[PDB]
Amino acid sequence: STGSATTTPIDSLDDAYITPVQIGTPAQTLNLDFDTGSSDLWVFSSETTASEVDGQTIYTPSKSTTAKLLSGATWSISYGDGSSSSGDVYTDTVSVGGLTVTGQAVESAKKVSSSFTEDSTIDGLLGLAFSTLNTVSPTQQKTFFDNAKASLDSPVFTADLGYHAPGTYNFGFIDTTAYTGSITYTAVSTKQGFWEWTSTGYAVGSGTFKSTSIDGIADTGTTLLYLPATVVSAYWAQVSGAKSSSSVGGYVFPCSATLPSFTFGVGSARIVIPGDYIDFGPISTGSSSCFGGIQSSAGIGINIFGDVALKAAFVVFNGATTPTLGFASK
Ligand code: NA
């Protein structure tokens, strides 16, 4: 089997991407944030505290003839941005892009933090990291990918995120039309439950490439590119008037600037992030200070290849017995 679904930016900055997901029978379609940095499929639901719902579409298990309470199971998750959610669990039929899993754990939120409530466009998350991070207790649950895997034509999914445009998540096949050149595969460590890999270095604009190992994760659920402070300082030093603002919470730059590209290494291959991809616009409406898309990972404890980096590539998440990541230009 395979599946193929379009993923759409939630706003003009590509802050996140939503993908329609069918849950239950008859289908209830919710728009979920596919997150390769977490392992829970959770949704706004008929159980979510009413004051914490503001415009989201909810899953109502009582209306699904295939829903069953996973008795005694609870979940609770905290993300890198300080957001959180928790609740109970149902099993139900879940379909993505025509690929169906029966018996998928659907984590129903009873509580969500303010950042979820305030984002009316995201109806929940669909985690795509390794199932060892799933927070369901007392019986940990599998991701949608791990449940689908054995049915798939190939044990892979691919992320093809757009810059200010829709893109695609495919399951079970490589679309050889969706990228240029060849795919370079690199080793993954699953020790922390993430798609963790080591980039071979970077370049700023037309500068020379610096060969240096940068361990980090491929995380579609993170907007920005978080890298070591040395790398990030080297990037923003090429932008006149850029600075790190403790008041704003990262590097800002004059909105009048033209940003340089940023290149990262994948083995001997190179992925180029155009400068435009690194502009996240005014820090507040009408400001002439703009927020940067490359930020320091210092204090986060891991480097994160988030959407800024991933949307410059066609990315293969190879979930074979020895997992690997693949990157191609596009
Ligand atoms: Na922000």
UniProtKB/Swiss-Prot annotation:
Top-rank EC class of the record's enzyme: hydrolase
Disulfide-bonded cysteines: 255-290
Keywords, in A-Z order: Aspartyl protease, Disulfide bond, Hydrolase, Protease, Signal, Zymogen
Domain Peptidase A1: start-end pairs: 17-328
Any GO BP annotation: proteolysis
Family: Belongs to the peptidase A1 family.
Superkingdom as given in the UniProt entry: Eukaryota
EC number annotated for this UniProt entry: 3.4.23.22
First-to-last residue of the parent protein present: 90 to 419 of 419
Catalytic residues identified in the record: 35, 199
Reaction(s) catalysed by this chain's protein: Hydrolysis of proteins with specificity similar to that of pepsin A, prefers hydrophobic residues at P1 and P1', but does not cleave 14-Ala-|-Leu-15 in the B chain of insulin or Z-Glu-Tyr. Clots milk
GO molecular function, one term: aspartic-type endopeptidase activity
Name of protein: Endothiapepsin
